[PDB]
Design an enzyme around this catalytic site. Structure first.
Site, PDB file in Angstrom:
ATOM      1  N   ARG A  30       5.314   5.226  -2.648  1.00  0.00           N
ATOM      2  CA  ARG A  30       4.116   4.394  -2.864  1.00  0.00           C
ATOM      3  C   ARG A  30       3.434   4.683  -4.236  1.00  0.00           C
ATOM      4  NH1 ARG A  30      -1.280   5.091  -1.881  1.00  0.00           N
ATOM      5  NH2 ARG A  30      -2.494   3.247  -1.176  1.00  0.00           N
ATOM      6  N   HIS A  36      -6.471 -12.656   2.027  1.00  0.00           N
ATOM      7  CA  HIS A  36      -6.279 -12.470   0.586  1.00  0.00           C
ATOM      8  C   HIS A  36      -6.626 -13.734  -0.159  1.00  0.00           C
ATOM      9  CE1 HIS A  36      -4.780  -8.496  -0.253  1.00  0.00           C
ATOM     10  NE2 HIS A  36      -4.027  -8.562   0.825  1.00  0.00           N
ATOM     11  N   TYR A  67       2.797  -1.770  -9.846  1.00  0.00           N
ATOM     12  CA  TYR A  67       1.549  -2.391  -9.428  1.00  0.00           C
ATOM     13  C   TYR A  67       0.391  -2.041 -10.398  1.00  0.00           C
ATOM     14  CZ  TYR A  67       4.084  -2.165  -4.862  1.00  0.00           C
ATOM     15  OH  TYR A  67       5.039  -2.205  -3.835  1.00  0.00           O
ATOM     16  N   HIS A 124     -10.370  -7.640   1.852  1.00  0.00           N
ATOM     17  CA  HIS A 124      -9.369  -8.587   2.362  1.00  0.00           C
ATOM     18  C   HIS A 124      -9.283  -8.543   3.906  1.00  0.00           C
ATOM     19  CE1 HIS A 124      -6.432  -5.143   1.605  1.00  0.00           C
ATOM     20  NE2 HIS A 124      -6.009  -5.522   2.795  1.00  0.00           N
TER      21      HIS A 124
END
Ligand SMILES: Nc1ncnc2c1ncn2[C@H]1C[C@H](O)[C@@H](COP(=O)(O)OP(=O)(O)OP(=O)(O)O)O1
Ligand SMILES: Nc1ncnc2c1ncn2[C@H]1C[C@H](O)[C@@H](COP(=O)(O)OP(=O)(O)OP(=O)(O)O)O1
Ligand SMILES: Nc1ncnc2c1ncn2[C@H]1C[C@H](O)[C@@H](COP(=O)(O)OP(=O)(O)OP(=O)(O)O)O1
Ligand SMILES: Nc1ncnc2c1ncn2[C@H]1C[C@H](O)[C@@H](COP(=O)(O)OP(=O)(O)OP(=O)(O)O)O1
Ligand SMILES: [Mg+2]
Ligand SMILES: [Mg+2]
Ligand SMILES: [Mg+2]
Ligand SMILES: [Mg+2]
Ligand SMILES: [Mg+2]
Ligand SMILES: [Mg+2]
Ligand SMILES: [Mg+2]
Ligand SMILES: [Mg+2]
Lengths: 480, 480, 480, 479
Positions: free
Chosen positions: D246, D97, D254, D120
């Site tokens: 999620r 990352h 998020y 990533h």
């Protein structure tokens, strides 16, 4: 017959071996669902609805955690599946002997009702465990899983009540450390405490400061005087002082709450008044009393918190007086708290003196004008022994430690190697006074007698002494 | 009108638009890049929290307490103006902190600027003045009914105390109680503690024993010596001793962790080696050093944790020595812990003795075979003062209480009216010794010098004393 | 005056003295002896909580919501009076629950007294009237400026809805928003749900992601159709769909747990077998049964979980059959779970067809060699209606919202304005089947009958179909 | 042997000394300076957590799962070697990352180096090889019974997938080990479990999913001649719940509208700085922010620190970048106009992203406008929300067992669980922002946006009727 899983809010998902399930699924064990952990504390902390049942599951689980962790870290100890199962059963079974409202029953009721017998929850657990095993065919099931009932039942009982020279028969001295898990008679550092800290706090709305998982990770077995014992890591000693500090804090805020205790005392009074009338059927159809049910385990099996509601809901006029006290609890017409004090100097109050104390309070001669005059019978005086579990001793003096540079060498650590900010004493007494007359004038008078009695006996000045008894506290130069 | 922010500690917190205007400036936003616990993040990986979020919480709690007092006692005449001034002080009392918080105000600035008398308190006041003048906040204060002349003085006095008998100009004696909220110079019971207890614990993975919401519910204003002060309820005194016990416990487990302190010390060493070469741009483009950034607030605004990475990532060969130390931190080749001791008796070690201490360890003459000889530059000695926030004093002697029967009458409570299980002293010193030389044979020598020095000076026996130096510990009779 | 209570869910809650008076009555205190989750305690050992503590929480949260609306919108003219009646309704909407809560209104009363329709809502109103009349609460209401005649009607309407177009007599349409707090008949978003989410989860060891404090912060009153209603903020719509998802999740994991339900069913069976013989004393000495105690509130007052232990501890041979069922619960010899299915397509299963279903499962003709043939009364078939609280309807279609640009303007939001990942339907039925015969061969047969019955009726394939019945599930093409 | 670390989420975790050696390297310690949630910290002040502690947790939980499987099923013959490799993969799958986590590979690198494909996961593999070679880890692996030829391959395969049975690190009879750290079959892995618990702890939103229950119930069974991890049948509801959560966390935190715009502002500043910042790599060579990914010695030094190198700079070549970062500190942010979604099966493709601000500035709302806006004043953000497998239901790719026959794997379909589940597993959200922030420009922006939603047959914004009362009556569905 494979592992059952139970979800417990304190520990998460706990695995139970099927021998444990068989023990759990008996009238003897399931009885613990109907005994509140904190007794009359539920009447002050409404979150404290938890019962002995769930506490027992947690003690069983944690006993298993500790024994498993020592075995993984040190295979040279030869811990067998047998040992693991025996320590878990003792963990599960060391609350079997508790009575209605837990500490109300062994702490207040049985001492007044049967002052001749010497009764503890520990003996009760042992006797109830014997009854559980014999009534439910558990010996063949033990054999099935490789336990040997003669040796192993002895081991389990010794873990609960202690010895019935190396004093134990259930295991030899190379397994000495196993007696330190469930009920630690050396220093009181055991898994029973760890579960109640976490569980009582969850329910009471007070937060737990002690980390038992950290303790388990740092625990090791080392030789001390030709016995293998559990040792803590040297630098973890401050967390152990903290463990006992937290126990004392919990007693101060919750378990000895002034109203919780008086509620327990009122229930005790109701049970004393009901004791002549309530009949409980035990073995062979013999009838037992609330006070005598401890003498037959079939009767004791049916002795739970239910007694409180049987009394409350009765219509028999023989139970009127018991019923009325329980009704006072529903309306919150409680015996009233007058105050708290402590003895000064060396002065310790003896267990034989307790009964004479209400007379000493009613005999004081406060110089204040009184409407009502109160007698001995109008006062309750409650004497509470607060300590670190070993009367006047420091339990950390009886803990063995190891350092990282020599992990198999046991050492000792003294209080001055840790801190100057620790307690200099490890025991004290609290004296609470209550009045059974609840009107404004009785209460006013009761306070004057109380504060005067403190003054006469050179006890500490009540915190609110100058407010509740402004005419009394100026006589005493020791108080300004 | 109000912004809402979600804080994992406090829930949904409401912010007045004046507070938003203060918060959305470079001076406040700076606090996002200053770790609360400094080098503690390198020992407790959950401790990623920065000063910014702690500041929001201090502001919120300051508002909670001031609102609670006003709702319950309207006769105190607490205005919106007062409320906002108390919240502003709460928000801005951490503005003065530097890189890695206590590392900077506690190790670096003392060693780099011994002639100035610097505190995070003084820095907060200076940074607050700069914040106000750089961002046009005085007209926004006027918008919402503050009076900048009086109220800025009030805010500064809450942060640093009197700026100079009633010693304060911001508010009169009938608002004395307002000065006990944010930074309580009487006894240290303030909302700043309460936020860091809860927040530090959430992040560290240690649990908080103290309940501030309960405290706020029981708080009242009463007259004490012609001043209106905040009073606690009498039977909450135990929780107050517990509050200070918890502060000490957290210092022992986390904030004074032996490795966390040494990491702080290594970073301080790197900052000293870099101080000639790092440039920080302040007012009118003039350049400052890490050590002089405190003299100009535009430069201090840019002095954050980023200094650590500017040095680690540098390629300038003038920073090679500073960069090498930070590199050793990343590889975990740290200066190594030798041990901990304490002084005996009346002996208190002073700030001007500190430099002489590695000298005294080097000069011990341990009689063993040593394969090496170390000298004073090879020793770090760290002297830590642990107390209840008031040097040798019991801060509960400076708390006022009220009783339930007369809630307007202030009283005092002495240590002996509470418990005999409390501390007999309220201050002590810990001494930790580390070795900059890390090899097998250096550490063995370092241990011998240490243990001999402890014996020489009549300090306490190291806990592992008998294992790290078997040959040195029998020569000392005061250790058994 | 103001009493403080510590609740593990809400912290320190303040109670007005009128509320204390209502709480300190036999009618309210009764709730200490009714488990919130009934037989769920027999599966989730942390679920020891009783309706009493839930009631305190509902009352507290009702006060939170009504207060927040008053602080934010003074123009609503919410009085101290209004606050009190909302809190009282919140406290007393659980008074009508009976032994083991939903076991009693949901299974027992329907089977014992099929002709009358009874709810815990009706019960609460009747028990509230009894509480007020029995304990001199009307004069105490007047003392704190309630108007008994109006306000008692208001409280009852909040609990059960209108008593008999604006249908309410307790308050006018300019205070309609007050009816949406305690028991929301429009959409079911109320404070009762909020307490049980947080409380049940604490005790069960399951965590819930609904934030009620956030919801309370964003709540506003607006005009909708000549009525003041509570409106949510537009962007909070996702959290409301999540609220109902969480309720459904809790029913799936805990409240409809397959074993918890069967234990509820066994207790119901025990109570039916005991109903003729257990006697409860009511008004003027008249005698009632468990089934008829609902007709006199003096009797209902004494109807609690204690009934379970009266039956368990009895020795009368009239109670042998009831007692033996409870004994089987102690030994964990429970009716055994066979499996779960659901209907396909349009197929609803009716209120009337429930009794026929055990007959149908014994009628299926599996082509398998079976050592025994089961009859109908060996099967229990349980039909559970899972929905979002309004049968087939989407409750979010009945929520009013406001937007940031015009906070006085109520709007509607449709499912397609939110997300495509939401449920397409809002109601469904689950079918569980249990066998009363528990040995290896009867169980093996029961699985053949059941899986064959599912195939016969074109219900969904049981998840374990292929394992429990390998010879049956190839006969169905659609199961592959 | 073992170090102990106290983590607020998992408690006291034990770390083997090989893991300590991997941890105590510049390449791993770098993760202390990369925020887990990037710009989410600027909205949720508790979200100060970094990639470092998340990595420790993933490594721990990888060990928990592999150990639980070994205890319950000895016949699988999981070795100390396997356990250590699974833990190392867990520790190292966040190594790649970059600054502000998903800001870097989600926004910066796609805009700065569109010609390349960087993930990533690729970075994690490269950074892992670099960590091993730079710090003498191969001899230390051998010391503890690992065989670097097989085991390094195994570890890399766990992180990035394979580089008929497609893997060289372990054979088909240890197939289940590839399902622990990064589960390419269905996405049920330990990386998710740590971030659910850890993000929630920091954000002040509570975690609904019980990973410990899942671990206690998990078993290895035969499925199509591989040994795979199977869940217990009746726990299938908890798995649908896992993915719901999620999605919930993406919606509340998020993809928070202001968090993304702050990420976008930081990306703009990083673009404006990209010509001028040097990062020194191997040999002494200079790389840029955008090219540091091509040298691992340079990438080691690329962290959140870049943000403050920019903000504190005085170089006039950095003025444009620095001023953007300054506007974030003063909270003078690009302003949110609204949110909509497509309809039917309009599916907006990556090739069309540049076109969207141009489409919004072209809308002709029939209303009097005091100011006019153009393409450059609009940001359009397209978010793909799904259950981790684009259009597909990940629970269709999960194997289960029943209590009656624990070694027998079975399948379960959506109708065997519930009718109340999502009947679509992917969707798109479209958020529109205006770069001009005064009262008249915002009024204009809302008219353009609502008209654009109408013109394109997107859903009616929730606030449509308040922000644009004159535009919403034209459209036929919306009333
Ligand atoms: N989804 C869940 N989340 C958390 N706890 C749960 C959940 N489902 C059940 N529990 C609790 C209730 C029990 O204390 C414990 C075990 O329940 P569960 O696995 O349902 O066992 P069971 O004995 O009913 O099923 P079986 O015998 O079919 O394995 O977990
Ligand atoms: N659904 C949620 N649950 C919990 N916290 C949330 C949620 N959404 C956002 N937060 C957090 C992030 C912030 O700390 C705080 C405020 O967020 P939010 O209400 O989204 O404000 P905002 O400023 O973006 O919206 P607006 O300006 O439109 O009112 O709550
Ligand atoms: N130290 C404490 N920390 C947390 N909760 C407590 C503590 N002491 C008591 N509680 C709980 C128990 C009750 O639910 C609630 C109120 O208790 P407390 O303040 O002891 O009331 P009380 O009625 O006995 O005192 P008083 O009538 O003298 O004001 O707080
Ligand atoms: N008393 C405590 N309670 C909870 N966590 C702690 C405590 N003390 C330390 N920690 C944390 C910090 C670290 O994350 C971890 C290990 O710390 P600690 O055991 O102090 O290690 P150490 O490496 O400094 O000791 P040593 O190397 O002497 O064994 O636990
Ligand atoms: Mg089961
Ligand atoms: Mg004990
Ligand atoms: Mg906003
Ligand atoms: Mg302070
Ligand atoms: Mg009281
Ligand atoms: Mg409802
Ligand atoms: Mg160490
Ligand atoms: Mg993944």
């Amino acid at each position: 017959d494979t592992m059952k899983v139970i979800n417990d809010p304190i520990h998460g998902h706990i695995e139970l071996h099927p021998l444990l399930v068989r023990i759990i699924d008996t009238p003897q064990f399931q009885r613990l669902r109907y005994i509140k952990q904190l007794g009359g504390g539920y009447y002050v902390f409404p979150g404290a609805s938890h019962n002995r049942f769930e506490h027992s599951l947690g003690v069983g689980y944690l006993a298993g955690c500790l024994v498993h962790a020592l075995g993984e870290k040190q295979p040279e100890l030869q811990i067998s599946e047998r040992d693991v199962l025996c320590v878990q059963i003792a963990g599960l079974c060391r609350n079997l002997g508790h009575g209605p409202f837990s500490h109300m029953f062994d702490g207040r009721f049985i001492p007044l009702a049967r002052p001749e017998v010497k009764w503890t929850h520990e003996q009760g657990s042992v006797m109830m465990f014997e009854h559980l095993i014999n009534s439910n065919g558990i010996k063949p099931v033990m054999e099935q899983y490789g336990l040997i009932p003669e040796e192993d039942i002895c081991f389990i009982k010794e873990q609960i009540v202690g010895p019935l020279l190396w004093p134990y028969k259930g295991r030899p001295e190379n397994k000495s450390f196993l007696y330190e898990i469930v009920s630690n008679k050396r220093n009181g550092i055991d898994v029973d405490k760890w579960d109640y800290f976490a569980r009582d706090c969850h329910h009471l709305g007070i937060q737990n400061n002690f980390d038992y998982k950290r303790f388990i990770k740092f625990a090791r077995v080392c030789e001390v005087d030709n016995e293998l014992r559990i040792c803590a890591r040297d630098k973890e000693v401050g967390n152990l002082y903290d463990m006992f500090h937290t126990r004392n804090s919990l007693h101060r805020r919750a378990y000895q709450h002034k109203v919780g205790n008086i509620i327990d005392t009122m229930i005790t009074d109701a049970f004393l008044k009901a004791d002549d009338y309530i009949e409980i059927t035990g073995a062979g159809g013999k009838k037992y009393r609330i006070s005598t049910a401890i003498d037959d385990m079939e009767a004791y099996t049916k002795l739970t918190d239910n007694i409180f509601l049987e009394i409350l809901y009765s219509t028999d006029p023989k139970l009127k007086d018991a019923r009325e006290i329980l009704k006072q609890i529903e309306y919150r017409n409680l015996f009233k708290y007058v105050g708290e004090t402590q003895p000064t100097g060396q002065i310790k109050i003896k267990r034989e003196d307790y009964e004479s104390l209400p007379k000493e309070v009613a005999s004081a001669k406060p110089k204040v004008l009184l409407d009502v005059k109160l007698k001995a019978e109008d006062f309750i005086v409650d004497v509470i022994n607060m300590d670190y579990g070993m009367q006047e001793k420091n339990p950390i003096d009886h803990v063995s430690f190891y350092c990282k540079t020599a992990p198999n060498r046991a050492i000792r650590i003294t209080k001055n190697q840790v801190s100057q900010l620790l307690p200099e004493k490890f025991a004290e007494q609290l004296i609470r006074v209550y009045c059974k007359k609840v009107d404004r004038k009785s209460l006013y008078a009761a306070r004057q007698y109380f504060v005067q009695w403190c003054a006469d006996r050179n006890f500490t000045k009540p915190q609110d002494g100058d407010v509740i008894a402004p005419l009394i506290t100026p006589q005493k130069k020791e108080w300004n």
